[PDB]
Design a protein around this ligand. Sequence first.
Ligand SMILES: Nc1ncnc2c1ncn2[C@@H]1O[C@H](COP(=O)(O)OP(=O)(O)NP(=O)(O)O)[C@@H](O)[C@H]1O
Ligand SMILES: [Mg+2]
Lengths: 350, 47
Amino acid sequence: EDSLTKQPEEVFDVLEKLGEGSYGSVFKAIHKESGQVVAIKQVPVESDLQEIIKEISIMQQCDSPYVVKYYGSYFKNTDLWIVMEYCGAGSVSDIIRLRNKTLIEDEIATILKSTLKGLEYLHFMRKIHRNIKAGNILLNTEGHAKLADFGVAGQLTDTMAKRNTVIGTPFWMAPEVIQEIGYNCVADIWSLGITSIEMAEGKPPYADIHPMRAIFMIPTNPPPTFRKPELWSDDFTDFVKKCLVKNPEQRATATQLLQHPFIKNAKPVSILRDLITEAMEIKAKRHEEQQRELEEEEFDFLKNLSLEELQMRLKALDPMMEREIEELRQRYTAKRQPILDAMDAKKRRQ
Amino acid sequence: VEWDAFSIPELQNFLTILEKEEQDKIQQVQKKYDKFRQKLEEALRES
Ligand SMILES: Nc1ncnc2c1ncn2[C@@H]1O[C@H](COP(=O)(O)OP(=O)(O)NP(=O)(O)O)[C@@H](O)[C@H]1O
Ligand SMILES: [Mg+2]
């Protein structure tokens, strides 16, 4: 608790940036004291503090190797610092994105084996994730899958902001969620089922279709399958069928899905080691490849910058303006091109 | 938009608005580059 009273920068050495979403930037960091690598997100306090903290209170009360561990918080320069567990390999969605390759069954089974463990843990505590998907399953540098970015109770009937953002992306929603406007534990199993297809095909069923249309299909049509079912085993195929059961009372629970062959006969997490190294390696190759690009064709970087690379940017600062605002003058000549072409005609008619 | 539907004075109001928007963003970047010199320079003073 004493380390919580100290200022953030004095406890952790923040390293490279890892990315972002819609509420701030995520960063890599190292605990100076124990050397245990952690993550640090930075959110602007000005933008709805209540919503951020509600998620914080839900994650902090979770204690599972399958749920991303939350450690603490600080306050620094209008930014609320959130210290999270470091999942180096990123989300399942990011890994599939980075390599430009879908996941093989064995890879899927292992990931699902721990994802199921997390769901079971949650559901047993009578909690609900309310928002399972590939993008919210995180793998660390070792190959251990973890549940993150939880949904929150009443996220459907909360006025307009979240009563509308969830509606916009209903591809992982169970049928009874659309018809009941609520969630049951088994809802996550359906989401898991869809997430299973998401990992094999790269995107969920109906993903490319207009939401409004999906909202109508999901509770009407029969559960989705693989666009090419021959490429997948019978254990895999069957497992999916057991998850995507429209009747929530006939839908397998997390406790039961752990007994299914596809999962029970899953490989160790070491099989992810290889797909994880490629992802992380490419993540590094992009990092260095991109850092050499932004450095060529050109309140922290200046403190970490050298005298001669600081004096030459200042000198090459004006040339960057003539190209910055000459583009703006070209953009607005385009916007006014129609209005002038129209005025041309009207000046010819009178 | 079917700009052929408007009149000369109306249309003129639109060119004016787009120009008023342009100048306000050309000057938004100038305030960005002039807050950047004042920091690169103040940093040179720390060397
Ligand atoms: N602890 C972590 N370690 C390594 N990478 C992480 C960690 N946390 C998040 N990331 C990655 O950084 C990305 C951006 O994080 P985030 O700001 O939460 O955006 P997002 O989660 O994808 N969108 P949202 O679900 O609405 O929060 C995530 O998608 C992860 O891929
Ligand atoms: Mg997140």
